mmCIF file of C-alpha atoms and ligand atoms in Angstrom:
data_model
loop_
_atom_site.group_PDB
_atom_site.id
_atom_site.type_symbol
_atom_site.label_atom_id
_atom_site.label_comp_id
_atom_site.label_asym_id
_atom_site.label_seq_id
_atom_site.Cartn_x
_atom_site.Cartn_y
_atom_site.Cartn_z
ATOM 1 C CA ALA H 298 -47.578 -86.629 10.164
ATOM 2 C CA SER H 299 -44.058 -86.271 8.670
ATOM 3 C CA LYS H 300 -40.673 -87.679 9.949
ATOM 4 C CA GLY H 301 -39.635 -84.198 11.011
ATOM 5 C CA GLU H 302 -42.471 -83.893 13.570
ATOM 6 C CA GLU H 303 -40.751 -86.601 15.661
ATOM 7 C CA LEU H 304 -38.081 -83.969 16.529
ATOM 8 C CA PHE H 305 -40.708 -81.846 18.273
ATOM 9 C CA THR H 306 -42.364 -84.181 20.789
ATOM 10 C CA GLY H 307 -40.410 -82.664 23.677
ATOM 11 C CA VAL H 308 -38.916 -79.354 24.798
ATOM 12 C CA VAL H 309 -36.387 -78.095 22.228
ATOM 13 C CA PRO H 310 -33.767 -75.417 22.967
ATOM 14 C CA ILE H 311 -33.824 -72.440 20.618
ATOM 15 C CA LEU H 312 -31.217 -69.897 19.468
ATOM 16 C CA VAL H 313 -32.051 -66.806 17.468
ATOM 17 C CA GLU H 314 -29.442 -64.537 15.815
ATOM 18 C CA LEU H 315 -30.347 -61.437 13.835
ATOM 19 C CA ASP H 316 -28.237 -58.879 12.023
ATOM 20 C CA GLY H 317 -30.101 -55.740 11.002
ATOM 21 C CA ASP H 318 -29.723 -52.486 9.134
ATOM 22 C CA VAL H 319 -32.655 -50.051 9.250
ATOM 23 C CA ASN H 320 -31.925 -46.740 7.529
ATOM 24 C CA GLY H 321 -28.236 -47.316 8.221
ATOM 25 C CA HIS H 322 -28.766 -48.061 11.862
ATOM 26 C CA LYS H 323 -26.872 -51.322 12.307
ATOM 27 C CA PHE H 324 -27.853 -53.629 15.176
ATOM 28 C CA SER H 325 -27.787 -57.314 16.245
ATOM 29 C CA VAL H 326 -30.088 -59.329 18.462
ATOM 30 C CA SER H 327 -29.408 -62.623 20.153
ATOM 31 C CA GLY H 328 -32.163 -64.785 21.657
ATOM 32 C CA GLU H 329 -32.307 -67.891 23.774
ATOM 33 C CA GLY H 330 -35.166 -70.034 25.080
ATOM 34 C CA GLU H 331 -37.140 -73.138 24.264
ATOM 35 C CA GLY H 332 -40.169 -74.392 22.421
ATOM 36 C CA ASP H 333 -42.683 -77.103 23.207
ATOM 37 C CA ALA H 334 -44.793 -77.686 20.118
ATOM 38 C CA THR H 335 -47.081 -80.096 22.028
ATOM 39 C CA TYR H 336 -48.530 -76.952 23.653
ATOM 40 C CA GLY H 337 -47.709 -74.515 20.833
ATOM 41 C CA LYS H 338 -45.488 -72.738 23.365
ATOM 42 C CA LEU H 339 -42.462 -70.490 22.942
ATOM 43 C CA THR H 340 -40.455 -68.809 25.714
ATOM 44 C CA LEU H 341 -37.634 -66.553 24.454
ATOM 45 C CA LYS H 342 -35.470 -63.741 25.784
ATOM 46 C CA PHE H 343 -33.856 -61.425 23.244
ATOM 47 C CA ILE H 344 -30.984 -59.016 23.873
ATOM 48 C CA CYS H 345 -29.747 -56.213 21.646
ATOM 49 C CA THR H 346 -26.035 -56.906 21.738
ATOM 50 C CA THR H 347 -25.002 -53.701 19.967
ATOM 51 C CA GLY H 348 -26.566 -51.251 22.395
ATOM 52 C CA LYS H 349 -29.955 -49.578 22.090
ATOM 53 C CA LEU H 350 -32.337 -51.123 19.610
ATOM 54 C CA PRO H 351 -32.978 -48.504 16.874
ATOM 55 C CA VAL H 352 -36.518 -49.716 16.138
ATOM 56 C CA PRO H 353 -39.289 -50.696 18.604
ATOM 57 C CA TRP H 354 -39.112 -54.270 19.919
ATOM 58 C CA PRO H 355 -42.654 -55.101 18.847
ATOM 59 C CA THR H 356 -41.776 -54.511 15.232
ATOM 60 C CA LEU H 357 -39.293 -57.429 15.385
ATOM 61 C CA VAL H 358 -41.499 -60.088 17.042
ATOM 62 C CA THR H 359 -42.608 -61.803 13.857
ATOM 63 C CA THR H 360 -39.095 -61.842 12.436
ATOM 64 C CA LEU H 361 -37.495 -63.181 15.629
ATOM 65 C CA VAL H 362 -39.896 -70.467 14.456
ATOM 66 C CA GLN H 363 -43.340 -71.585 13.268
ATOM 67 C CA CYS H 364 -42.202 -75.186 13.531
ATOM 68 C CA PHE H 365 -43.263 -74.767 17.203
ATOM 69 C CA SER H 366 -46.919 -74.232 16.292
ATOM 70 C CA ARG H 367 -49.340 -76.783 17.707
ATOM 71 C CA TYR H 368 -50.948 -78.646 14.835
ATOM 72 C CA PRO H 369 -53.962 -80.585 16.102
ATOM 73 C CA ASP H 370 -53.709 -84.297 15.363
ATOM 74 C CA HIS H 371 -56.402 -84.110 12.711
ATOM 75 C CA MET H 372 -54.378 -81.455 10.856
ATOM 76 C CA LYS H 373 -50.903 -82.861 11.188
ATOM 77 C CA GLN H 374 -50.655 -83.622 7.469
ATOM 78 C CA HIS H 375 -50.680 -79.816 6.958
ATOM 79 C CA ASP H 376 -47.541 -79.019 8.999
ATOM 80 C CA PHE H 377 -44.981 -77.917 6.452
ATOM 81 C CA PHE H 378 -42.649 -76.440 9.030
ATOM 82 C CA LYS H 379 -41.799 -79.584 10.972
ATOM 83 C CA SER H 380 -41.745 -81.660 7.789
ATOM 84 C CA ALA H 381 -38.775 -79.658 6.486
ATOM 85 C CA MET H 382 -36.686 -80.604 9.587
ATOM 86 C CA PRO H 383 -33.939 -81.215 10.400
ATOM 87 C CA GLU H 384 -32.466 -79.756 7.239
ATOM 88 C CA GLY H 385 -34.720 -76.768 7.627
ATOM 89 C CA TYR H 386 -36.302 -74.015 5.594
ATOM 90 C CA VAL H 387 -35.634 -70.540 4.290
ATOM 91 C CA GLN H 388 -38.176 -67.966 5.447
ATOM 92 C CA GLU H 389 -38.369 -64.636 3.589
ATOM 93 C CA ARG H 390 -40.701 -61.739 4.323
ATOM 94 C CA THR H 391 -41.569 -58.298 3.170
ATOM 95 C CA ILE H 392 -43.079 -56.304 6.036
ATOM 96 C CA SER H 393 -44.664 -53.103 4.734
ATOM 97 C CA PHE H 394 -45.404 -50.490 7.432
ATOM 98 C CA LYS H 395 -48.322 -48.349 6.222
ATOM 99 C CA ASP H 396 -47.235 -44.785 5.401
ATOM 100 C CA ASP H 397 -43.663 -45.701 6.288
ATOM 101 C CA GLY H 398 -40.769 -47.989 5.356
ATOM 102 C CA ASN H 399 -40.405 -51.716 4.891
ATOM 103 C CA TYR H 400 -38.378 -54.593 6.286
ATOM 104 C CA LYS H 401 -37.102 -57.356 4.023
ATOM 105 C CA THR H 402 -35.988 -60.395 5.949
ATOM 106 C CA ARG H 403 -34.263 -63.685 5.089
ATOM 107 C CA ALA H 404 -33.876 -66.410 7.680
ATOM 108 C CA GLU H 405 -32.672 -69.951 7.781
ATOM 109 C CA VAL H 406 -34.405 -72.132 10.386
ATOM 110 C CA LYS H 407 -32.791 -75.539 10.988
ATOM 111 C CA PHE H 408 -31.400 -77.864 13.625
ATOM 112 C CA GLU H 409 -27.791 -77.518 14.774
ATOM 113 C CA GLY H 410 -27.499 -80.718 16.700
ATOM 114 C CA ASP H 411 -30.498 -80.872 19.046
ATOM 115 C CA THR H 412 -31.003 -77.060 19.023
ATOM 116 C CA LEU H 413 -33.404 -75.270 16.685
ATOM 117 C CA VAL H 414 -31.677 -72.189 15.232
ATOM 118 C CA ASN H 415 -33.208 -69.132 13.530
ATOM 119 C CA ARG H 416 -30.550 -67.039 11.719
ATOM 120 C CA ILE H 417 -31.838 -63.814 10.221
ATOM 121 C CA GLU H 418 -30.780 -60.875 8.112
ATOM 122 C CA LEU H 419 -33.045 -57.850 8.206
ATOM 123 C CA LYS H 420 -32.871 -54.821 5.933
ATOM 124 C CA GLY H 421 -35.141 -51.795 6.524
ATOM 125 C CA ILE H 422 -35.409 -48.936 4.038
ATOM 126 C CA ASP H 423 -37.398 -45.764 3.482
ATOM 127 C CA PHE H 424 -38.343 -45.175 7.074
ATOM 128 C CA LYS H 425 -39.397 -41.695 8.158
ATOM 129 C CA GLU H 426 -37.087 -40.030 10.649
ATOM 130 C CA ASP H 427 -39.871 -39.393 13.117
ATOM 131 C CA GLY H 428 -42.479 -41.881 11.965
ATOM 132 C CA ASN H 429 -43.827 -44.430 14.408
ATOM 133 C CA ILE H 430 -40.893 -46.793 13.963
ATOM 134 C CA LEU H 431 -37.762 -44.597 14.059
ATOM 135 C CA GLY H 432 -39.571 -42.168 16.403
ATOM 136 C CA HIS H 433 -40.328 -45.002 18.873
ATOM 137 C CA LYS H 434 -44.054 -44.255 19.126
ATOM 138 C CA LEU H 435 -45.189 -47.863 19.485
ATOM 139 C CA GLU H 436 -46.404 -49.279 22.766
ATOM 140 C CA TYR H 437 -44.633 -52.293 24.241
ATOM 141 C CA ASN H 438 -47.495 -54.745 23.760
ATOM 142 C CA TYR H 439 -48.877 -57.029 21.081
ATOM 143 C CA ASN H 440 -52.218 -57.987 19.590
ATOM 144 C CA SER H 441 -53.287 -61.475 18.634
ATOM 145 C CA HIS H 442 -53.335 -62.303 14.961
ATOM 146 C CA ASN H 443 -53.813 -65.077 12.416
ATOM 147 C CA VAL H 444 -51.125 -66.151 9.901
ATOM 148 C CA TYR H 445 -52.918 -67.262 6.692
ATOM 149 C CA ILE H 446 -51.016 -70.059 4.949
ATOM 150 C CA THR H 447 -51.354 -71.347 1.411
ATOM 151 C CA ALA H 448 -49.285 -73.930 -0.489
ATOM 152 C CA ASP H 449 -46.787 -72.893 -3.147
ATOM 153 C CA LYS H 450 -46.389 -76.191 -4.964
ATOM 154 C CA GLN H 451 -44.078 -74.854 -7.725
ATOM 155 C CA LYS H 452 -41.592 -73.949 -5.073
ATOM 156 C CA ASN H 453 -42.248 -77.016 -2.924
ATOM 157 C CA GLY H 454 -43.196 -74.727 -0.064
ATOM 158 C CA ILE H 455 -45.688 -72.291 1.385
ATOM 159 C CA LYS H 456 -46.718 -68.640 1.342
ATOM 160 C CA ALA H 457 -48.381 -66.646 4.050
ATOM 161 C CA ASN H 458 -50.109 -63.341 4.313
ATOM 162 C CA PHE H 459 -51.239 -61.509 7.441
ATOM 163 C CA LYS H 460 -51.650 -58.090 9.043
ATOM 164 C CA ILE H 461 -49.981 -56.987 12.258
ATOM 165 C CA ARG H 462 -51.505 -54.049 14.072
ATOM 166 C CA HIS H 463 -49.041 -52.253 16.325
ATOM 167 C CA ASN H 464 -50.584 -50.008 18.950
ATOM 168 C CA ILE H 465 -49.407 -46.413 18.716
ATOM 169 C CA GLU H 466 -49.023 -44.534 22.054
ATOM 170 C CA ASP H 467 -51.825 -42.113 21.047
ATOM 171 C CA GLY H 468 -54.485 -44.857 20.613
ATOM 172 C CA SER H 469 -54.083 -45.312 16.877
ATOM 173 C CA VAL H 470 -52.590 -48.254 15.042
ATOM 174 C CA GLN H 471 -49.590 -48.796 12.828
ATOM 175 C CA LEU H 472 -50.354 -51.453 10.242
ATOM 176 C CA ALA H 473 -47.576 -53.821 9.212
ATOM 177 C CA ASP H 474 -48.591 -55.932 6.219
ATOM 178 C CA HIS H 475 -46.689 -59.249 6.091
ATOM 179 C CA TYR H 476 -45.947 -61.310 2.982
ATOM 180 C CA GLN H 477 -44.026 -64.532 3.680
ATOM 181 C CA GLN H 478 -42.514 -67.358 1.672
ATOM 182 C CA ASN H 479 -40.903 -70.569 2.989
ATOM 183 C CA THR H 480 -38.949 -73.132 1.001
ATOM 184 C CA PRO H 481 -37.183 -76.271 2.191
ATOM 185 C CA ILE H 482 -33.429 -76.427 2.373
ATOM 186 C CA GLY H 483 -33.258 -80.243 1.988
ATOM 187 C CA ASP H 484 -34.514 -82.352 -0.914
ATOM 188 C CA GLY H 485 -36.614 -84.725 1.132
ATOM 189 C CA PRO H 486 -40.403 -84.594 0.777
ATOM 190 C CA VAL H 487 -42.321 -81.983 2.660
ATOM 191 C CA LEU H 488 -45.999 -81.538 3.525
ATOM 192 C CA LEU H 489 -47.805 -79.083 1.279
ATOM 193 C CA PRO H 490 -50.809 -77.897 3.205
ATOM 194 C CA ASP H 491 -54.389 -76.969 2.460
ATOM 195 C CA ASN H 492 -55.295 -73.382 3.304
ATOM 196 C CA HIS H 493 -55.296 -72.834 7.024
ATOM 197 C CA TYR H 494 -54.075 -70.347 9.606
ATOM 198 C CA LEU H 495 -51.947 -70.085 12.699
ATOM 199 C CA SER H 496 -53.654 -68.373 15.638
ATOM 200 C CA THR H 497 -50.896 -66.517 17.437
ATOM 201 C CA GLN H 498 -50.911 -64.848 20.840
ATOM 202 C CA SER H 499 -47.813 -63.001 22.072
ATOM 203 C CA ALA H 500 -47.046 -61.373 25.419
ATOM 204 C CA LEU H 501 -44.073 -59.064 25.853
ATOM 205 C CA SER H 502 -42.364 -58.336 29.140
ATOM 206 C CA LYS H 503 -39.091 -57.278 30.755
ATOM 207 C CA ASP H 504 -36.608 -59.127 32.986
ATOM 208 C CA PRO H 505 -36.424 -56.969 36.081
ATOM 209 C CA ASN H 506 -32.774 -57.994 36.530
ATOM 210 C CA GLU H 507 -31.683 -57.073 33.002
ATOM 211 C CA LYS H 508 -30.006 -53.740 32.234
ATOM 212 C CA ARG H 509 -29.399 -54.393 28.511
ATOM 213 C CA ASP H 510 -32.043 -53.487 25.917
ATOM 214 C CA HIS H 511 -34.080 -56.673 25.692
ATOM 215 C CA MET H 512 -37.464 -58.382 25.214
ATOM 216 C CA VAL H 513 -39.021 -61.355 26.994
ATOM 217 C CA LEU H 514 -41.626 -63.126 24.788
ATOM 218 C CA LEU H 515 -44.234 -65.753 25.702
ATOM 219 C CA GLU H 516 -46.024 -66.914 22.568
ATOM 220 C CA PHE H 517 -48.712 -69.488 21.854
ATOM 221 C CA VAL H 518 -49.359 -70.624 18.299
ATOM 222 C CA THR H 519 -52.102 -73.055 17.271
ATOM 223 C CA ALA H 520 -53.016 -74.204 13.768
ATOM 224 C CA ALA H 521 -56.704 -73.922 12.873
ATOM 225 C CA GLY H 522 -58.998 -73.467 9.897
ATOM 226 C CA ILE H 523 -59.453 -77.081 8.754
ATOM 227 C CA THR H 524 -62.229 -78.947 10.351
ATOM 228 C CA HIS H 525 -63.069 -82.585 10.743
HETATM 229 MG MG1 MG P 806 -34.901 -44.664 -2.769
#
């Protein structure tokens, strides 16, 4: 493997903190839960601490810890994400919503003590007033997808590209093209992978006891695409 994967053999508590501005709508989200990379499993509850979320929850799922992906044993030499731990990595994305605006995100993912933390800044521009995002026309659900990873050896890191399809309430789909880059924060060696993908499955729900604007997420992520 890598030395960093030793930090992931058990259940790890997670904290997520996001500050956002989409078209001048300022918001924050705080999340808590845990990850168990042995099973590729994430359980997180997110709360909008500023009030009502000004964009649909599903549009934030990808932004709101791929170090919890399950890498099969035969592929463990391809796990960049854990290899960068505990010092962590910077994750940047451009998320381009077809016929609408874009999110640019910058996150730092690292350990703070025994807790894995994801700190994010999100900026959204050029959204349509009553497009699917600011008009809240997206269903509260989520389709499975693959995250296609490639090495970026000049930057000592990785890139990824994938497509999210958000279901629109009228039966159509809102495409969200994702371009991602990750670079280590520390100077220790990291694993630079062969092309492969992360198979991701996400289920969204609500806490029946929660009155704040929130999202409960159950996610499974498994690396694939390299055989033996
Ligand atoms: Mg302009």
